[PDB]
Nucleic acid binder design. Structure first.
Lengths: 129, 120, 227, 218, 82, 107
RNA sequence: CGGUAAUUCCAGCUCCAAUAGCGUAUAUUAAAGUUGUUGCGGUUAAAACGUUCGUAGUUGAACUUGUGCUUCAUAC
RNA sequence: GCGAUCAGAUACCGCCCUAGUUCUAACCAUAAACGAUGCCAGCUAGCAAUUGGGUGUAGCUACUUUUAUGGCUCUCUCAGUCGCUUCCGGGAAACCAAAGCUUUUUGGGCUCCGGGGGAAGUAUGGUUGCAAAGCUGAAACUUAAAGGAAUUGACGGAAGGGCACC
């Protein structure tokens, strides 16, 4: 059954990034997906994505750019306090310079470089670099 | 059959013929005489070979010469074999032959309403 | 003493002997075929040291009875930002290493050295993390702060002391006794560092001179201009 | 305009059966195929493939050496055109065998170093295409539907199995290399014929003499 | 790349693929500089001013770089009325 | 070390397939893993045709042939050399060769 | 290695490593991505139950107040 | 049990046949029970067939008639399956369109299983069976290799060639 519905947009972006596609058709559009790509959109790792609506679940057609390498998804959502947030930024993020760990804190989905500013902690969602 | 020709008789037969086909004869006995001129040899049975092989192929260049040789006289004839034969053109002058579905492509693309007629 | 000035064979090395290219990374800029080591004797050669890593013998079973030929490794690296790797088999150990040092020079590639966490003062280690696999060994290069030197096995520490990478973290899986697959694994990891689209490289270039365009006259002339 | 299609040429393009494409399409090449008849006549777009020529023409200039553009062929029906194509432009004609590999050369002081390979067929002339994969080479290939496109930029979809198609397009190349700062006085009608890139007959060559001087005695 | 005291520090900047944005690896030997030159709009008369295109091996080895020229051809308007 | 893509021969989604006795050793070998040869051979073999058609009654009658579908164990068609030992790049072919003529043993 | 010219044995000369320290045993930890959650492996190297059903257990799609609009504190 | 064969032959080959083979009634519960590849889900490419079902002929053909049911061909689509072609993915390789997306210390759930080779599927206990046996299942001891895939050695008892009076 379709277990993790965040996850296989990120294995359809990453899979279709590698072959170098320019547009990507996700299915079926969580509002955690759109909150995730908007985090990937403020940093320009993604185009402007359009949500072709059904009355079923939603479908997204995403425009790809070609700036990113890997969007993954940390299943299960491990509970990540602020103190062990640094543990993950060594692991998932390939340099201290760039890269992002998206996590759901309670004050809205933000990456670690916002939640380490707003002093929030939450559960982890995914990453990208 | 069983008297094949080695490399030296083969690799010298070309290099004298494409150079000195001119003022060269078919007569092997005088083709025996010309090998001491246009090259050198240490021994006379090699001139029994290297003249014998060129004369065992000398008539063969008249009748459909094989590859690997440039006689320097057929290529200047090949300029005339680069002949334009007049006057091959559009055959039925348009041509009127069309596949009857790309006649649309002769109209949807081309503004030429010229006579390309349906042949099924 | 040269004692023999190299002949321009290709059109590329024509230009470096005629001096129309005076920068080594120009051929790296368009990814040219660098197929004469007499190219890199011009640009570098000052500060290019050879180290061998193994002179691993290797044998074949003929009918009476064996025959040994020598797969000598050699490793050249300009001490800041260029590295190479050389492997060849021959009947003598001298005619491997006199010719292995050729085969390392032909594959000399540029290193990207990046700041670990704070961009101050001539970046040192590596911009990202890179794995190079060559047959079941895969060395996983990782940045480190200033002043902690190259921690590895002693072999690819020699691949990085001569690469200009200053302070690196490494970890190597697999049969790490096979030296061919442990040199080449790091070589295919060091050379990777300029093939990874860090977000620093998004604004593009004017995108080209392509020096066969920029110098189409000297290759149009057949006269071998000297100097 | 003058850089547009100029439909006197399509009157000649029907003659070389450029509309006739092969049966099997190969999805890279489907962007040029207009449509198909029943039972395997895949009719390509004719203005696409004419627009490729001026695109190929806009590519073939800005190579300041006309020497350094290697025209090649392997098939002999593509050979009489190609060496005669190098008569007017100063390209190097490569008819037949390549001797792989050309890449540390033998006698020649300068190299046989190309800079834009161009090739009548990607199927059968596959050898130096995949040998153009080493020395940074743009390759224009005359294509049919069934064609590889590996290391190909650009393709030119014509017919590439008739004697007349390759007989046409090299004359179609011959115009636009000279129309575009090649000084043919801006697309006037041609002093050279548009059929010299043809077999006078299939081999063996019958006794069709130079300008066909007929024998008064039998 | 560049440190705080405004320096493009290490060695160079590689060209990116003009088709799908990827980097040109510094040993890419199915790489290209494709210099399509423009033309006078009236008749013939090739003008100076080319259009330089860079196309990586990863795209040409797919074979999908006949059409990936055309997108860079059409968006630059070099091939026209498409 | 797997030698064939299909292993033995050709068992795609059946689970298990019926056996057949080999023609000249009577070995239980299966149906798809069986070198099937199918002969249509004349009854006089090509030299008595000029002798039977003397003593024919009719207008040459033309004579019948045999019709049998012979199965072989894999050894009993390497030993008979119906089928031998292809190369490693020619174990991958099924479609060629005859390439010369109409095949004999019919004839 | 030693099977009668021992770069390993018994020595002598020499030489090296640490040094008021050094060797030996068992134990333990790191090496060990050879117990692996981070992090292993299972076509052929050890390793996918003969098959499917199925409670325990583990794991389960989408949707249910979101940016607007005006101002100032505020980067310039 | 014969008859041969062989140095012997409780074997292969040859003859005779008995339990068995076969049908219902149960037991047994294993196999190279193999795709040596658990299962549910998504993605990443061509091309050729090919079994069902759907659909368009702007196809032929059947004659009941130009027809219409039937067949074929062409076009598209599901559910696929089998082959090839290749990675422009992985792998120790042989290879694999999954054995790929297992990325750089990686993450779609879930279960079963492996930890140098032997000893040993043994010993012993429990449990099932009429029994054969099945499931569970060690250690003392021994040991530095055992194993995988591939190269090069036999134009050494295997095919296909090609020579000479050692």
């Amino acid at each position: 059954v379709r277990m993790n519905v965040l996850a296989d947009a990120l294995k359809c972006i990453n899979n279709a990034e590698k072959r170098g596609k320019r547009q990507v058709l996700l299915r079926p559009c969580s509002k955690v997906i759109i909150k995730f790509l908007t985090v990937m959109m403020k940093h320009g790792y993604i185009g402007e994505f359009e949500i072709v609506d059904d009355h079923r679940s939603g479908k997204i057609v995403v425009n790809l750019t070609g700036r990113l390498n890997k969007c993954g998804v940390i299943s299960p959502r491990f509970d990540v306090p602020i103190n062990d947030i640094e543990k993950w930024t060594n692991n998932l993020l390939p340099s201290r310079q760039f890269g992002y760990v998206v996590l759901t804190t309670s004050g809205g989905i933000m990456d670690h470089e916002e939640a380490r500013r707003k002093h929030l902690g939450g559960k982890i969602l995914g990453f990208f670099f | 059959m069983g008297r094949v020709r080695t490399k030296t008789v083969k690799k010298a037969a070309k290099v004298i013929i494409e150079k000195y086909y001119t003022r060269l004869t078919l007569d092997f006995h005088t083709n025996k005489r010309i090998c001491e001129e246009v090259a050198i040899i240490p021994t006379k049975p090699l001139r029994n070979k290297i003249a014998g092989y060129v004369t065992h192929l000398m008539g063969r260049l008249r009748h459909s010469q094989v590859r690997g040789i440039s006689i320097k006289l057929q290529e200047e004839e090949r300029e005339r074999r680069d002949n334009y034969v007049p006057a091959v053109s559009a055959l039925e002058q348009d041509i009127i032959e069309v596949d009857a579905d790309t006649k649309e492509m002769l109209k949807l693309l081309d503004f030429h309403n010229i006579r390309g007629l349906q042949l099924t | 003493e040269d004692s023999k000035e190299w002949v321009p064979v290709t059109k590329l090395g024509r230009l470096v002997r005629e001096g129309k290219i005076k920068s080594l990374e120009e051929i790296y800029l368009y990814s040219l075929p660098i197929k004469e080591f007499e190219i890199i004797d011009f640009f570098l050669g000052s500060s290019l040291k050879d180290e061998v890593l193994k002179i691993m013998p290797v044998q074949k079973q003929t009918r009476a009875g064996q025959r040994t030929r020598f797969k000598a490794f050699v490793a050249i690296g300009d001490n800041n930002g260029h590295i190479g790797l050389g492997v060849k088999c021959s009947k003598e150990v001298a005619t491997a290493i006199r010719g292995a040092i050729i085969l390392a020079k032909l594959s000399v590639v540029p290193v990207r050295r990046g700041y670990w966490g704070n961009k101050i003062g001539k970046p040192h280690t590596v911009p990202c993390k890179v794995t190079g696999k060559c047959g079941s060994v895969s060395v996983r290069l990782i940045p480190a702060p200033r002043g902690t030197g190259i921690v590895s096995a002693p072999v690819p520490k020699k691949l990085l002391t001569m690469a200009g990478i200053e302070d690196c973290y490494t970890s190597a899986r697999g049969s790490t006794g096979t030296l061919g697959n442990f040199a080449k694994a790091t070589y295919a990891a060091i050379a990777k560092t300029y093939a990874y689209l860090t977000p620093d490289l998004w604004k593009e270039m004017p995108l080209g001179s392509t020096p066969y365009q920029a110098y189409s006259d000297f290759l149009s002339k057949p006269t071998p201009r000297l100097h | 305009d003058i850089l547009s299609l100029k439909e006197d040429d399509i009157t000649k393009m029907l003659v070389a059966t450029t509309h006739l494409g092969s049966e099997n399409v190969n999805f890279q090449m489907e962007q040029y195929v207009y449509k198909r008849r029943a039972d395997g006549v895949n009719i390509l777009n004719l203005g696409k493939t004419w627009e490729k020529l001026q695109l190929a023409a806009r590519a073939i200039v800005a190579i300041d050496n006309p020497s350094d553009i290697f025209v090649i062929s392997s098939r002999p029906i593509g050979q009489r055109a190609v060496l005669k194509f190098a008569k007017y432009t100063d390209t190097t004609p490569i008819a037949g065998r390549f001797t792989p590999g050309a890449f540390t050369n033998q006698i020649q002081p300068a190299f046989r170093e190309p800079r834009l390979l161009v090739v009548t067929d990607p199927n059968t002339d596959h050898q130096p295409i995949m040998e153009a994969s080493y020395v940074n080479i743009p390759v224009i290939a005359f294509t049919n539907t069934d064609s590889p496109l590996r290391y190909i930029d650009i393709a030119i979809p014509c017919n590439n199995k008739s004697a007349h198609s390759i007989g046409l397009m090299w004359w179609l190349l011959a115009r636009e290399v000279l129309r575009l700062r090649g000084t043919i006085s801006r697309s006037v009608e041609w002093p050279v014929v548009v059929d010299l890139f043809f077999y006078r007959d299939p081999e063996e060559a019958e006794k069709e003499e130079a300008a066909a001087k007929e024998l008064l005695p039998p | 790349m560049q440190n705080d005291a405004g320096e493009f520090v290490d060695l160079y900047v590689p060209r990116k693929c003009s088709a799908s944005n990827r980097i040109i690896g510094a040993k890419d030997h199915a790489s290209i500089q494709m210099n399509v030159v423009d033309v006078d709009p009236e008749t013939g008369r090739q003008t100076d001013g080319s259009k330089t295109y860079a196309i990586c091996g990863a795209i040409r080895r797919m074979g999908e770089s006949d059409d990936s020229i055309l997108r860079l051809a059409k968006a630059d308007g070099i091939v026209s009325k498409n | 070390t797997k030698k064939r893509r299909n292993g033995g021969r050709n068992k795609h989604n059946r689970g298990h397939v019926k056996p057949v006795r080999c023609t000249n050793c009577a070995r239980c070998v299966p149906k798809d893993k069986a070198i099937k040869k199918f002969v249509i051979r004349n009854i006089v073999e090509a030299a008595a045709v000029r002798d039977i058609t003397e003593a024919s009654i009719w207008d040459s009658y033309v004579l019948p042939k045999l019709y049998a579908k012979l199965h072989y164990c894999v050894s009993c068609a390497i030993h008979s050399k119906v089928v031998r030992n292809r190369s490693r790049e020619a174990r991958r072919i099924r479609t060629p060769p005859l390439r010369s003529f109409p095949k004999d043993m019919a004839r």
